[PDB]
């Protein structure tokens with residue numbers, strides 16, 4: 001079952017999941033994405049919209065991560081273009097103080113020394129928004145137009161056991 | 176003609192080139208490297224060893240860039256492993272406020288919003304050291320053992336016209 005990463009204008013996310021960081025036993029996520037869209041947000045996450053946020057998106061067809069927290073502030077592009085209309089497996093996880101990005105089974109990016117343990121964040125609640133941000137795009141380190149015209153499927157986010165709740169503005173439109 | 180990136184213990188660089196930034200008309204470099212060594216420095220560069228430095232090396236066989244300046248401080252791994260004993264083409268250049276890394280003709284990493292124009296650096300003199308750093312490895316953001324047992328060939332560094340001088344401790348040992 002595949003869902004549309006964009007719905008309507010393409011402003012707000014198609015879904016927001018909230019997690020209790022003190023209950024996480026897994027700090028990784030994975031999913032498949034397919035699109036012809038060269039720019040947009042795949043997912044945004046934060047423990048604090050001002051002080052500790054993260055965004056994985058596409059720019060010029062390639063993955064881009066923006067991260068802003070106490071330890072690091074960055075805007076980094078990496079990996080092959082994914083806007084070739086084919087399904088691509090994507091994994092994002094924490095490994096020690098690093099954030100690793102794997103695409104189609106290959107590690108394409110490792111942001112080192114960027115964060116303390118998820119389970120140790122001052123604000124023990126993490127939000128994960130799909131297909132959109134939880135603040136205006138103008139507030140990104142480097143703005144981009146969030147709308148991502150693509151499909152998401154086979155997605156797993158951290159541990160379902162740590163998930164506090166999940167919301168969706170409109171009905172998840174299938175692909 | 177190929178030269179050894181390591182000579183002797185593997186502490187100091189095999190060569191140091193100095194450039195006048197006010198005369199540069201090209202902010203890119205390229206070379207080929209071959210090695211079985213998973214860790215080490217390919218090249219280091221700075222306009223200031225304390226406040227504005229850069230290091231391209233290998234860690235776990237993959238490219239890693241560390242950069243420290245007024246705009247950004249990072250430690251980032253990216254691209255495929257290069258320690259497969261085969262020749263690999265590598266290009267490192269500035270594009271706007273970004274630093275791009277291309278391997279075997281493919282862009283594998285783009286560090287965005289990391290620097291003002293090279294021609295505008297307070298200290299208009301850039302040093303490029305090959306196979307080593309110009310400060311102790313303990314001073315890196317993330318230390319690694321600098322010795323890189325590999326070969327370098329077909330190397331071009333910025334513009335020869337902007338090169339002020341070049342030095343080499345020992346005789347460049349051919350591969």
Ligand SMILES: C[C@]12CC[C@@H]3c4ccc(O)cc4CC[C@H]3[C@@H]1CC[C@@H]2O
Pocket residue numbers: 027028029044045046047052053054067068069092093094099114115126128157158
């Ligand atoms: C945990 C994830 C990787 C690490 C990400 C991170 C990493 C560091 C940080 O300071 C904040 C965030 C928020 C979103 C997180 C992501 C949500 C799912 C993904 O697996």
Ligand SMILES: C[C@]12CC[C@@H]3c4ccc(O)cc4CC[C@H]3[C@@H]1CC[C@@H]2O
Pocket residue numbers: 202203204219220221222227228229242243244267268269274289290301303332333
């Ligand atoms: C200009 C190069 C890319 C950009 C690098 C950089 C980029 C930003 C910075 O603040 C310092 C340096 C020093 C070394 C530079 C490199 C030396 C050769 C390479 O082409």
Ligand SMILES: [Ca+2]
Pocket residue numbers: 037038039040145146147148149
């Ligand atoms: Ca788009």
Ligand SMILES: [Ca+2]
Pocket residue numbers: 212213214215320321322323324
């Ligand atoms: Ca080594």
